Write a protein that binds this ligand. Structure first.
Ligand SMILES: O=P(O)(O)OC[C@H]1O[C@](O)(CO)[C@@H](O)[C@@H]1O
Ligand SMILES: [Mg+2]
Ligand SMILES: [Mg+2]
Ligand SMILES: [Mg+2]
Length: 329
């Protein structure tokens, strides 16, 4: 056990020939602290009475749970104290948060402090999603610094509070998985340079919305169930937590879908702190992420709480669905 490859060491070793201020390492070390604190609260949530609602509604009009508030506070406090950030965007705050000059650093951070809130009370996998941008402009920090295309990401990933706690981190040359050792409260490198399979055998979507689906989604699903070449039909999985469904897509292959539909032109999931981070992870693992008509990472945001359709996973799977949308174009 005497040589520990922790997230910190990883993020220091690589960025050492890249030089840098090392505030990315500060950022991520800080974030890891909040994630550990969220994991331990989650693992004991019913005894600590942390289930239930906060008694509020957010800008996307979700019903705010207790762990939403707790996790939001932890992420914000640790990011500010990191001295690595200047602008913060959270699912739980109407406006971007501008860091006090005294603790400012050069990064902009967009995050979902707790993802999968419908699955909180039934003990299903939940998580934390983040994307990291460098502030470009020279003028005073503002919400506008968060309105960057996802292709501008310097780092992104998620924490998954599942059967084990995992930190999935994507940076410019690739994706790496770090598992939480609860005995020493360190994230340890467990999966190096993760690449997604070119094609999977699992499709993931809420078919409860079948009546609202566009003809292309409708066709694709039918094809997964009734393949034209007599291949085996695809298996279906939908946990209901974006972080768990995307994580399985990453390690098992296949496709994850939250499409636009007749009642939601822009889908449900949020571009800044849900769709862009996962699209980035997917592209760095060699997969794709599309709205059905354009790459998510290429969208230029105008609203920090903007929604986008997302279709992601194995390149050959996502490409088959894109061909169907094309065909229907
Ligand atoms: O109940 P639905 O509409 O399938 O929504 C599930 C999606 O909503 C979210 O909870 C939004 O956070 C995602 O984590 C999840 O993928
Ligand atoms: Mg929510
Ligand atoms: Mg979410
Ligand atoms: Mg959330």
């Amino acid at each position: 056990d005497t040589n520990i490859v922790t997230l910190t060491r990883f993020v220091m070793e690589e960025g050492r020939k890249a030089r840098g201020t090392g505030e990315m390492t500060q950022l991520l070390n800080s974030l890891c602290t909040a994630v550990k604190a969220i994991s331990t609260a989650v693992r004991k949530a019913g005894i600590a009475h942390l289930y239930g609602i906060a008694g509020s509604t957010n800008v996307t009009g979700d019903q705010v749970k207790k762990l939403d508030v707790l996790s939001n506070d932890l992420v914000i406090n640790v990011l500010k104290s990191s001295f690595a950030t200047c602008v913060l965007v959270s699912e739980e705050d109407k406006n971007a948060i501008i860091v006090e000059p005294e603790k400012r650093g050069k990064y902009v951070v967009c995050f979902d402090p707790l993802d999968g809130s419908s699955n909180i009370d039934c003990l299903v996998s939940i998580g934390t999603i983040f994307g990291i941008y460098r502030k470009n402009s020279t003028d005073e920090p503002s919400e506008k610094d968060a309105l960057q295309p996802g292709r501008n990401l310097v780092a992104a990933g998620y924490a998954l509070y599942g059967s084990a706690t995992m930190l999935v981190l994507a940076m410019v040359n690739g994706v790496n998985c770090f598992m939480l050792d609860p005995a020493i409260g360190e994230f340890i490198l467990v999966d190096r340079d993760v690449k997604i399979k070119k094609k999977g055998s699992i499709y993931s979507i809420n078919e409860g919305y079948a009546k609202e689906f566009d003809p292309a989604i409708t066709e694709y699903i039918q094809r997964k169930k009734f393949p034209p070449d007599n291949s085996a039909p695809y298996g279906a999985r939908y946990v209901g937590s974006m972080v768990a469904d995307v994580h399985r897509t990453l390690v098992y292959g296949g496709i994850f879908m939250y499409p636009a539909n007749k009642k939601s032109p822009k889908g449900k999931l949020r571009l800044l702190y849900e769709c862009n981070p996962m699209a980035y992870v997917m592209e760095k693992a060699g997969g794709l992420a599309t709205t059905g008509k354009e790459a998510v990472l290429d969208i230029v945001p105008t609203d920090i709480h903007q929604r986008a359709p997302i279709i992601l996973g194995s390149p050959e799977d996502v490409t088959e669905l894109l061909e169907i949308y094309q065909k229907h174009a």
